[PDB]
Amino acid sequence: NDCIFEVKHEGKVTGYACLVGDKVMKPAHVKGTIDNADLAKLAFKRSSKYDLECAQIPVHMKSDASKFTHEKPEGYYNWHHGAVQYSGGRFTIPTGAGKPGDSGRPIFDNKGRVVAIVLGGANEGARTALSVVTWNKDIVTKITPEGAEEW
């Protein structure tokens, strides 16, 4: 659980919003008002280009947030459902580990910092490529494989 908040429409949970550094990351294509009432009050500068909605976190009460990093050396990374491998440029998971509703879950490195946030996936065989919102220095770069549905 730690520092991720579920987002639901009525009683149906649709996604999760992560607290990375100083921003309340959340993907645009999910519909919800966030479980916390205080976070719902925030104003999100949403962008359709990156499928993201972000706002300044209330550091006065929620300064505790996941650390982030920009470099992604190829190897293995861990998230809630299994572990994921940076396939020289693509995020790949076993086909089962991906399912609609997981959109907005972050992913961590070996050292425990976020490097991306997942939106959906497409599968070529047993493994499923991931559509994530990674970031270089001071800039985010959405990545999307071919024929990737939105979770």
Partner: peptide, 8 residues
Amino acid sequence: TPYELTPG
């Protein structure tokens, strides 16, 4: 927005 959306 690309600078605004990026954390930190």
